[PDB]
């Protein structure tokens, strides 16, 4: 029984992609062990309860956790030191067992795992969870072809669309961690000559040309995305579904604006007021999922003022909401997972990027894939309520509303084609599985 290890970075949007890939591998006959921390096995729904499930291997004691007194640098430095020893101890017992693992797939953001794999003679591959366009940007920042602030107002990178400085990732959003994040992201290409191959969370039709560029770095590159669950009885003591779905069920098809800037962005009340008022001014039905600490910054009386039009809740499953036919538009922060979800479910977007790679994903969503528009922001970075209202109207009601929806249904078709049997991504996964059986 061939078995491999998958080692994701324990953080927002890094685990689900590797878990999804693990599920595809198990469906093709490969047993998968997920190497993770005590907190992820504990404080998350990683149950691995069925006999065909991913096996969870906890290798940490929780002493690698981020302290309140820690900077990002101290946290990543301690994590690397402790998890390196933890992985060395784990492989020691596993590389001399009856059935040793034949491969380790690890998050690309932990390039130190390759050195551990190399030391034990274990085949390995980093997994790039972000867009391939970001791989190009980070590589060119690493090699001096692009600079923190760009010298030239137009940036032309190999096999990439032209970008202005307002389309490049904003790592300055959290000033204390700016240099740390840039060093982290640029250090993902330093030891790729020893990688068996590179895995990318994308699909050929989406970034094919950029992937061709990536292959020129010397190693095989395998697109295996998008990592969205393929899914997208009768109880007398329970209701059929969730409250969100029920509320959406009573709306006309394609009429509601699903709003979510994700679970990590901390927006300012000033900008939060204008955004809420912007959504209010449109007079459209909208389902806004926002966490408790962000919801307290909402303007006083806002939810009562949009009583008939708005449903503001603390949680709903994003996938089931985006797959609902009553939803016609997605006001999103343009995180890579959200970006791929929008494309996979054929839903046009109002791009409101906040930080990091979100601005680059927004650029591709608006100017390259053409499935929506970016909210115009001012010099201060504040998006006014008319810009917000205008943008929502333009994508849902304006001249290009039919265009955007047509582009979205096309990207939705190619995305399903990619992960469907014989698709570009499925083919890459089958070839990898075939090599592991050799």
SS (H, E, C) the chain: CCEEEEECCCCCCCHHHHHHHHHHHHCCCCEEEEEECHHHHHCCCCCCCCCCCCEEEECCCCCCCCCCCCCHHHHHHHHHHHHHHHHHHHHHHHCCCCCCCCCEEEECCCCHHHHHHHHHCCCEEEEECCCHHHHHHHHHHHCCCCCCCCCCCCECCCCCCCECHHHCCEHHHCHHHHHHHHHHHHHHHCCHHHCCCEEECCCHHHHHHHHHHHHCCCCCEEECCCCCCCCCCCCCCCCCCCHHHHHHHCCCCCCEEEEECCCCCCCCHHHHHHHHHHHHHHCCCEEEECCHHHHCCCCCCHHHHCCCCEEEECCCCHHHHHCCCCEEEEEECCCHHHHHHHHHCCCCEEECCCCECHHHHHHHHHHHCCCEEECCCCCCCCCCHHHHHHHHHHHHHCCCHHHHHHHHHHHHHHHHHHHCCCCHHHHHHHHHHHHHHC
The terminus-to-terminus CA distance of the chain in angstroms comes to 12
| Dist. CA 115–CA 133, nearest whole Å | 26
Q: How far apart are CA 163 and CA 389, in angstroms?
A: 26
Is residue 107 flagged as an active site residue?
A: yes
Integer Cα distance of 204 and 423 in angstroms: 10
Domain 236-417 belongs in CATH node 3.40.50.2000: yes
CATH 3.40.50.2000 residue ranges for the chain = 236-417
Q: Which of 307, 402, 387 is CA-nearest to residue 350?
A: 387
Distance CA 229, CA 24 (A): 10
Residue 314 has, within 13 A of its CA and on its CB side, a CA count of: 4
Rounded CA-CA distance 352/200 in Å is 25
How far apart (Å, rounded) are the C-alpha atoms in residues 106 and 167?
29
Report resolution in angstroms.
2.0
Contacts 24+ apart (CB under 8 A), 312-317: 312/288, 313/243, 313/244, 313/287, 313/288, 313/289, 314/289, 314/290, 315/289, 316/242, 316/243, 316/244, 316/245, 316/287, 316/289, 317/242, 317/244
Task: Enumerate the known binding-site residues for UDP-alpha-D-glucose.
Answer: 263, 316, 318, 336-338, 341, 357-358
Q: Are 87 and 101 in contact (CB under 8 A)?
A: no
What's the CA gap between 159 and 42, in Å, rounded? 43
Q: How many CB atoms lie within 10 A of CB 350?
A: 27
Q: Which of 3, 107, 204, 324 is catalytic?
A: 107
Q: Is cis: bond before 226, omega within 30 of 0?
A: yes
Please report, for residues 167, 237, 265, the alpha-carbon distance to residue 300 in angstroms, rounded to integers and kept in the order given.
34, 38, 21
Judge whether 143 counts as a catalytic residue.
Answer: no
Chain centroid to CA 342: 11
Six-digit token pair at 177? 């961690």
Breaks in the chain (C–N beyond 2.5 Å) sit after 232
Exactly one of 3, 14, 24, 324 is catalytic; name it. Answer: 14
In whole angstroms, give the CA distance from residue 82 to residue 391: 47
Do 176 and 156 touch, CB atoms closer than 8 A? no
Rounded distance, CA 91 to CA 95, Å? 5
**Residues facing residue 124 across a β-bridge:** 104
Neighbours of 180 (CB within 10 A): 18
CB 6 within 8 A of CB 87: no
Cα angle value 168/174/175 (rounded, 5°): 95
Asked if residue 390 lies in contact with residue 321, where contact means CB atoms within 8 angstroms, the answer is: no
The dihedrals phi and psi of 122, each to the nearest 5 degrees, come to -105, 125
Q: Annotated binding site, which residues?
A: 14, 140, 263, 316, 318, 336-338, 341, 356-358
As a whole number of angstroms, the distance between CA 12 and CA 365 comes to 21
Is 311:286 a contact under the CB 8 Å cutoff?
yes
Please give the distance of CA 52 from its chain centroid, rounded to a whole number: 26
* Token output for 189: 């290409």
Residue 42: which residues within 8 A CB-CB, separation 6 or more? none
| Sheet containing 31-36: order of strands | 55-58, 31-36, 3-7, 104-107, 124-128, 198-200, 221-223
Residues comprising the chain, all counted: 438
Residues forming the annotated binding site for an anthocyanidin?
Answer: 14, 140, 356
The span from the CA of 211 to the CA of 158, in Å, is 11
Contact yes or no for 342/371 (Cβ under 8 A): yes
Using left for φ > 0, alpha for ψ between -120 and 50, and beta otherwise, residue 94 falls in alpha
Token pair for 240: 């059929």
Distance CA 173, CA 179 (A): 11
- Alpha-carbon span 173 to 262, nearest angstrom: 15
Torsion angle of C-alpha atoms 278, 280, 284, 288, degrees rounded to 10: 90
Cα gap 226→280, rounded to integer Å? 33
119-154 burial code (b ≥16 CB/10 A, e <16): ebebbbbbbbbbbbbbbbbbbbbbeeebeeeeeeee
Total Cβ atoms within 10 A of residue 288: 22
Token look-up 């008939």 returns: 308
């Amino acid at each position: 029984d061939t078995h491999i290890l998958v080692f994701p970075f324990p953080a927002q949007g890094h685990i689900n992609p590797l878990l999804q890939l693990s599920k595809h591998l198990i469906a093709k006959g490969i047993k998968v062990s997920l190497v993770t921390t005590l907190h992820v096995s504990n404080r998350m729904q990683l149950q691995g309860a069925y006999s065909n499930s991913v096996k969870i291997e906890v290798i940490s004691d929780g002493s690698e956790d981020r302290l309140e007194t820690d900077t990002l640098r101290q946290y990543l430095d301690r994590f690397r030191q402790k998890m390196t020893k933890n992985l060395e101890d784990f492989l020691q017992k596993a590389m001399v067992s009856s059935n040793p693992p034949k491969f380790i797939i690890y998050d690309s953001t932990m390039p130190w795992v390759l050195e551990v794999a190399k030391e034990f003679g274990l085949d390995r591959a980093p997994f790039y969870t972000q867009s391939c366009a970001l791989n190009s940007i980070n590589y060119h920042v690493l090699h001096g072809q692009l600079k923190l602030p760009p010298e030239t107002p137009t940036i032309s990178l190999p096999s990439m669309p032209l970008l202005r400085p307002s389309d490049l990732p904003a790592y300055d959003f959290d000033p204390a961690s700016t240099d740390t994040i840039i060093d982290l992201l640029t250090s993902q290409y330093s030891n790729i000559q020893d990688a068996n191959l590179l895995f990318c969370n994308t699909f050929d039709k989406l970034e094919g040309e950029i992937i061709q560029w990536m292959e020129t770095l010397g190693r095989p590159v395998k697109t295996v995305g998008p990592t969205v669950p393929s899914a997208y009885g009768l109880s007398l003591f329970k209701p059929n579904e969730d409250v969100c779905l029920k509320w959406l069920d009573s709306k006309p098809s394609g009429s509601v604006l699903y709003v979510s800037y994700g679970s990590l962005v901390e927006m300012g009340e000033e900008q939060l007021k204008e955004l809420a008022l912007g959504i209010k001014e449109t007079g459209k039905f909208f389902l806004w999922v926002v966490r408790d600490t962000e919801a307290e910054k909402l303007p006083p009386n806002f939810v009562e003022s949009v009583a008939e039009k708005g449903l503001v809740v603390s949680w709903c499953s994003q996938l089931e909401v985006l797959a609902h036919p009553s939803v016609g538009c997605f006001f999103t922060h343009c995180g890579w997972n959200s970006t791929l979800e929008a494309l996979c479910l054929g839903v046009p977007v109002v791009a409101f990027p906040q930080w990091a790679d979100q601005v680059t994903n927004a650029k591709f969503l608006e100017d390259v894939w053409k499935v929506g528009k970016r909210v115009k922001r001012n010099e201060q970075r504040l998006a006014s309520k008319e810009e917000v209202r205008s943008c929502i109207w333009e994508v849902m009601e304006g001249e290009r509303a039919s265009e955007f929806k047509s582009n979205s249904m096309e990207w939705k078709k190619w995305a399903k084609e990619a992960v469907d049997e014989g698709g570009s991504s499925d083919k890459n996964i089958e070839e990898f599985v075939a090599m592991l059986k050799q």
